């Protein structure tokens, strides 16, 4: 009978794996998510406010591939991870992201990681909220 991991360790390790996967195989990113996961990654509606959110692995994959991630580079400047409801981990990431060798843009992201349930110490992404500062401020 082992011990459950600390929230900081889970959040840091997840941030690592998430952004390396975003850079190396973004078409794989959907594998982080479940049937009931929410996902938004910035975006601005035409003459409208920030974009809305899609749900579930298939729609999340569709959105990710429509975002056309190429040579994604991420500079992480801050990560918080705290225990939350039913052994979850809430994570707040502050950093810079550049897609397709374009502008290095400041962003804020909120993750909620939940236990996958079947495999010990496995987590999936229940919530993924990403916003660029230059689309808000």
């Amino acid at each position: 009978v082992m011990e459950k991991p600390s929230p900081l360790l889970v959040g840091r390790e997840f941030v690592r794996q998430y952004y390396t996967l975003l850079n190396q195989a973004p078409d794989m990113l959907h594998r982080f998510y479940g049937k009931n996961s929410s996902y938004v990654h910035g975006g601005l509606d035409s003459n409208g406010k920030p974009a809305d959110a899609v749900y579930g692995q298939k729609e999340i994959h569709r959105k990710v591939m429509s975002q056309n991630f190429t040579n994604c580079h991420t500079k992480i400047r801050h990560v918080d991870a705290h225990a939350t409801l039913n052994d979850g981990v809430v994570v707040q990431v502050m950093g810079l992201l550049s897609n397709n060798n374009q502008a290095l843009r400041r962003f804020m992201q909120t993750f909620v990681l939940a236990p996958e349930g079947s495999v010990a110490n496995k987590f999936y992404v229940h919530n993924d909220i990403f916003r660029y500062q230059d689309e808000v401020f």
Binding site: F14, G34, N121
Partner: peptide, 11 residues
């Protein structure tokens, strides 16, 4: 112990 892993439940 097991290592920490990440991934959906595959349901």
């Amino acid at each position: 112990a097991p290592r920490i892993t990440f991934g959906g439940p595959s349901d």
